[PDB]
DNA sequence: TCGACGAAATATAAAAATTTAAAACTAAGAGAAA
């Protein structure tokens, strides 16, 4: 992780060459959707950037229409454009801990967290950094089990984030 | 046998569910098996079912044969 | 402390697996996911009450799935008494609990090149085995096998392969490690024989197979007719509230049952005393516990 | 597309309101099967409307295996009358449905080893154990049973409405994944 | 000795409803050893 900060902070690229730099997918890899998985709302002061966690590509429609599982298939709760699309999600040797799955195990993982990014706009869901896993991930945790924690220093640096950004 | 499938046809016309009355008489059967002959015995004969609701025959073979083995 | 609790948990975790692992012959990295998807039970609150055999045999099962292997879970039950379907349903059971995601395939290719060596080996090793994955891959194809225990399939195309070509084995003899049902084998064999012209049996299949269409798996062929022959509207949805409505509950509602039921809801009393008779009899001391 | 799911079964309990005990309910049984060591509960079995619904000594009754949701609601009405006419007040309210069943055929052959690699997030495909797949779908929670024969089972929704629903959102799926 | 059928075992989704482990999780208790 720090050999990467200070090799890209050595820090920049080719312009105008990004629009391109999007290339084939094979079938096969995990890949990584923004923020519109079913719903696409005002998250609150955006920076999660690709906000959800990876998923499987089985088909392809187009060369700016890929098929992955996300939801149920009614009403077209299965394809997205490129544009909302992302390729790498890999190295568990420098991001040793895996992607907590359900409440019980958020329960025993809570007390191991590295940031909190923003609340859900929808009713009151809390969107998070956990420890030692890639930041592409995100970790959704609800107040059933945020009670557990050492929450008061985080929404104190969501609050100053708030500050900086607005 | 079929003069098995009689005797149970008459147990099951004399009287209700007797479950453990025809497995202590039988020491070779279980509930599963008789629960399996109910089901495949209350679709496949609706004339009988019918028929041994509106018989009731008098419990004349239960008793005496209680007595034979045990 | 609470990270003193963890380190015994997992050392006995690992023995066990490592004890199964030193009769099941896995290779290490496949005990060390296993072990790893252990600790990934024990954060998701592990299912106690439940045998130790049982979630370390699914997590070396998943374990063995991840990457393309031949174990099977009889191997994984093969102690003179283990009862190897508890054990599936216990990996039914974590496969949600767990979350399981990139899910791998199931293709009984690789189930070839461990059961040759067994039964109906060869000089080279390359004649039956590359016949039964090159019939295989193009039975597969035609939408046959579908949910029918790779194992059987795999027997079966290994006799298929023996049958074409030459070689002087029992038939019976494959049923000590297939473990396969002789009903379901040749129901799977002259299936096969019913979907192939047998043009050159007795030489060499056909090198071009190719069969687009035309075949149905044989339970399409049961049940899609539904019998024995020998994007709608919303409004055509009715809702089932107005069934539960048209029966009414009300207090006073105790006499709308009248279909001869009122004479015959409970045993008559007058036969009460000759049900006690047997009852007294028989079901005397099953009340008594 | 015209197909319409049949309503096969239904799992539907109501609660009499009343702390009994069940000895006394089967001493007086025309059709009962009970075994005191096992549980305290009674199955009963009555030939019409062909249902075996379960009653508890906590005073509560799972009526299950109608075909019909009248059919139902008539046999829990009926048991009510028989468990007044015993020895019991225990009063008929508060009927709620669990779960409904449904099989149909979609007539057209689905391909089953491409839908367990594609849906395997809502699916769980296992040759060695059952051969069919299980779908299961979260919105809304109906758990289908996927075949290649066609014939799926359609557990999981306490309504009708929600049943149709289901099958008019998997019937797109079933219509990628056909068979040429 | 190949074909012909019957039938329990599972999933399945609920509501339930008494007993049985049963394996993480604490907590003494000894034994080291600078």
């Not at chain 2, 569910?17 to 495949?40: C, E, G, H, M, W």
């Not at chain 3, 998807?37 to 024990?42: D, E, F, G, S, V």
């Given at each position: 992780?720090?050999?990467?900060?200070?090799?890209?902070?050595?820090?920049m690229?080719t312009?105008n060459n990004?629009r391109?730099?999007?290339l084939?997918?094979?079938?096969?890899?995990?890949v990584?959707?923004?923020?519109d998985?079913?719903?696409?709302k005002?998250?609150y002061?955006?920076?999660?950037?690709?906000?959800?966690?990876?998923?499987?590509?089985?088909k392809?429609?187009?060369?700016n229409?890929?098929?992955?599982?996300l939801?149920?298939?009614?009403?077209?709760?299965?394809?997205?454009?490129v544009?909302?699309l992302?390729?790498?999600?890999?190295?568990?040797?420098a991001?040793?801990k895996?992607?907590?799955?359900?409440?019980?195990?958020?329960?025993?993982?809570?007390?191991?967290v590295?940031?909190?990014?923003?609340?859900?706009?929808?009713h009151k869901?809390?969107?998070?950094?956990?420890?030692?896993?890639?930041?592409?991930?995100?970790?959704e945790?609800s107040?059933?089990?945020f009670?557990?924690?050492?929450?008061r220093?985080?929404?104190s640096i969501?609050?100053?984030?708030?500050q900086?950004?607005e | 046998?079929?003069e098995?499938?009689?005797?149970?046809?008459?147990?099951?016309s004399?009287?209700?569910?007797?479950?453990?009355?025809i497995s202590?008489?039988?020491?070779?059967?279980?509930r599963?098996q008789?629960?399996?002959?109910?089901?495949?015995?209350?679709?496949?004969?609706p004339?009988?079912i019918?028929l041994a609701?509106?018989?009731?025959?008098?419990?004349?073979?239960?008793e005496?044969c209680?007595e034979?083995?045990? | 402390?609470?990270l003193?609790?963890?380190?015994?948990?997992?050392?006995?975790?690992?023995?066990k697996?490592?004890?199964?692992?030193y009769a099941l012959?896995?290779p290490?990295?496949?005990?060390?996911?296993?072990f790893?998807w252990?600790?990934?039970?024990?954060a998701?609150?592990?299912?106690?009450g439940?045998?130790s055999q049982?979630?370390?045999a699914?997590?070396?099962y998943?374990?063995?799935?991840?990457?393309?292997?031949?174990?099977?879970?009889?191997?994984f039950s093969?102690?003179?008494?283990?009862?190897?379907?508890?054990?599936?349903?216990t990996?039914?059971?974590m496969?949600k609990?767990?979350?399981?995601?990139?899910?791998?395939?199931?293709?009984?290719?690789?189930?070839?090149?461990?059961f040759?060596?067994?039964?109906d080996?060869?000089?080279?090793?390359?004649?039956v085995?590359?016949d039964?994955?090159?019939?295989?891959?193009?039975?597969?194809?035609?939408?046959?096998?579908?949910?029918?225990?790779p194992?059987?399939?795999?027997?079966?195309c290994?006799?298929?392969?023996?049958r074409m070509?030459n070689l002087?084995?029992?038939?019976?003899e494959?049923?000590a490690?297939?473990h396969?049902?002789?009903?379901?084998?040749?129901?799977?064999?002259?299936?096969?024989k019913?979907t192939?012209?047998?043009?050159?049996?007795?030489?060499?299949?056909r090198?071009?197979?190719?069969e687009?269409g035309?075949?149905?798996?044989?339970?399409?062929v049961?049940?899609?007719?539904?019998?024995?022959?020998?994007?709608?509207?919303?409004?055509?949805?009715?809702?089932?509230?107005?069934?539960?409505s048209?029966?009414?509950?009300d207090?006073?509602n105790?006499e709308?049952v009248?279909?001869?039921?009122?004479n015959?809801?409970?045993?008559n009393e007058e036969?009460?005393?000759?049900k006690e008779?047997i009852?007294?009899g028989?079901?005397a001391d099953?009340?008594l516990? | 597309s015209?197909?319409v799911?049949?309503?096969?079964?239904?799992?539907?309990?109501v609660?009499?309101g009343?702390?009994?005990?069940?000895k006394?309910?089967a001493?007086?049984?025309?059709?009962?099967?009970?075994?005191?060591?096992?549980?305290?509960?009674?199955?009963?079995?009555?030939?019409?409307?062909?249902?075996?619904?379960?009653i508890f000594a906590?005073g509560?009754?799972?009526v299950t295996?109608?075909?019909?949701?009248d059919?139902?609601?008539?046999?829990?009405?009926?048991?009510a009358?028989?468990?007044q006419?015993?020895g019991?007040?225990?009063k008929?309210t508060?009927?709620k449905?669990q779960?409904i069943?449904?099989?149909?055929?979609?007539?057209?052959?689905?391909?089953?080893?491409?839908?367990?690699?594609?849906?395997?997030?809502f699916?769980?495909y296992?040759?060695?154990?059952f051969?069919?797949?299980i779908?299961?779908?979260?919105?809304?929670?109906i758990?289908?049973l996927?075949?290649?024969?066609?014939?799926i089972?359609?557990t999981?929704a306490?309504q009708?409405?929600?049943?149709?629903?289901?099958?008019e959102?998997?019937?797109p799926?079933?219509?990628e994944f056909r068979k040429?």
């Amino acid at each position: 992780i720090q050999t990467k900060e200070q090799l890209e902070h050595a820090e920049m690229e080719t312009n105008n060459n990004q629009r391109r730099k999007p290339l084939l997918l094979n079938i096969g890899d995990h890949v990584l959707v923004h923020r519109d998985a079913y719903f696409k709302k005002g998250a609150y002061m955006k920076v999660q950037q690709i906000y959800v966690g990876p998923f499987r590509v089985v088909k392809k429609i187009n060369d700016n229409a890929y098929e992955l599982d996300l939801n149920s298939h009614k009403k077209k709760h299965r394809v997205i454009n490129v544009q909302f699309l992302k390729k790498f999600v890999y190295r568990p040797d420098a991001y040793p801990k895996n992607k907590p799955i359900s409440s019980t195990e958020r329960i025993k993982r809570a007390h191991e967290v590295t940031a909190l990014i923003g609340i859900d706009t929808t009713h009151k869901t809390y969107l998070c950094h956990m420890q030692d896993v890639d930041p592409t991930l995100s970790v959704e945790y609800s107040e059933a089990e945020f009670c557990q924690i050492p929450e008061r220093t985080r929404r104190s640096i969501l609050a100053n984030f708030r500050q900086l950004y607005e | 046998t079929v003069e098995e499938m009689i005797k149970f046809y008459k147990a099951l016309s004399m009287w209700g569910t007797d479950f453990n009355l025809i497995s202590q008489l039988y020491p070779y059967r279980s509930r599963k098996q008789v629960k399996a002959k109910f089901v495949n015995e209350e679709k496949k004969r609706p004339i009988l079912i019918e028929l041994a609701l509106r018989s009731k025959l008098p419990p004349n073979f239960d008793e005496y044969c209680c007595e034979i083995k045990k | 402390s609470a990270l003193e609790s963890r380190e015994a948990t997992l050392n006995n975790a690992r023995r066990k697996l490592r004890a199964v692992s030193y009769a099941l012959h896995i290779p290490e990295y496949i005990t060390d996911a296993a072990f790893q998807w252990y600790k990934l039970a024990l954060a998701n609150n592990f299912v106690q009450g439940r045998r130790s055999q049982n979630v370390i045999a699914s997590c070396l099962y998943v374990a063995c799935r991840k990457e393309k292997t031949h174990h099977m879970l009889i191997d994984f039950s093969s102690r003179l008494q283990v009862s190897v379907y508890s054990i599936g349903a216990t990996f039914l059971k974590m496969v949600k609990k767990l979350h399981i995601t990139e899910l791998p395939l199931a293709d009984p290719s690789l189930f070839i090149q461990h059961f040759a060596e067994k039964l109906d080996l060869a000089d080279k090793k390359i004649k039956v085995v590359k016949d039964a994955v090159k019939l295989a891959q193009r039975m597969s194809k035609d939408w046959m096998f579908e949910g029918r225990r790779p194992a059987g399939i795999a027997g079966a195309c290994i006799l298929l392969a023996c049958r074409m070509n030459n070689l002087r084995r029992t038939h019976t003899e494959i049923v000590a490690v297939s473990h396969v049902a002789e009903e379901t084998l040749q129901q799977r064999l002259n299936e096969f024989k019913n979907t192939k012209a047998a043009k050159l049996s007795v030489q060499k299949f056909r090198e071009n197979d190719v069969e687009d269409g035309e075949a149905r798996p044989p339970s399409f062929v049961k049940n899609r007719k539904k019998e024995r022959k020998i994007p709608r509207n919303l409004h055509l949805l009715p809702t089932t509230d107005t069934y539960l409505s048209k029966v009414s509950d009300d207090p006073d509602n105790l006499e709308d049952v009248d279909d001869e039921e009122l004479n015959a809801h409970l045993l008559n009393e007058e036969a009460s005393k000759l049900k006690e008779r047997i009852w007294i009899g028989l079901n005397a001391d099953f009340l008594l516990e | 597309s015209g197909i319409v799911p049949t309503l096969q079964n239904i799992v539907a309990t109501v609660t009499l309101g009343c702390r009994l005990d069940l000895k006394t309910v089967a001493l007086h049984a025309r059709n009962a099967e009970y075994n005191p060591k096992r549980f305290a509960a009674v199955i009963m079995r009555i030939r019409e409307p062909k249902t075996t619904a379960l009653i508890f000594a906590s005073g509560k009754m799972v009526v299950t295996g109608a075909k019909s949701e009248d059919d139902s609601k008539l046999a829990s009405r009926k048991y009510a009358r028989i468990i007044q006419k015993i020895g019991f007040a225990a009063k008929f309210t508060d009927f709620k449905i669990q779960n409904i069943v449904g099989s149909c055929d979609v007539k057209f052959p689905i391909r089953l080893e491409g839908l367990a690699f594609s849906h395997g997030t809502f699916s769980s495909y296992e040759p060695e154990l059952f051969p069919g797949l299980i779908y299961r779908m979260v919105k809304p929670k109906i758990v289908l049973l996927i075949f290649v024969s066609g014939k799926i089972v359609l557990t999981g929704a306490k309504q009708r409405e929600e049943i149709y629903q289901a099958f008019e959102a998997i019937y797109p799926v079933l219509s990628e994944f056909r068979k040429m």
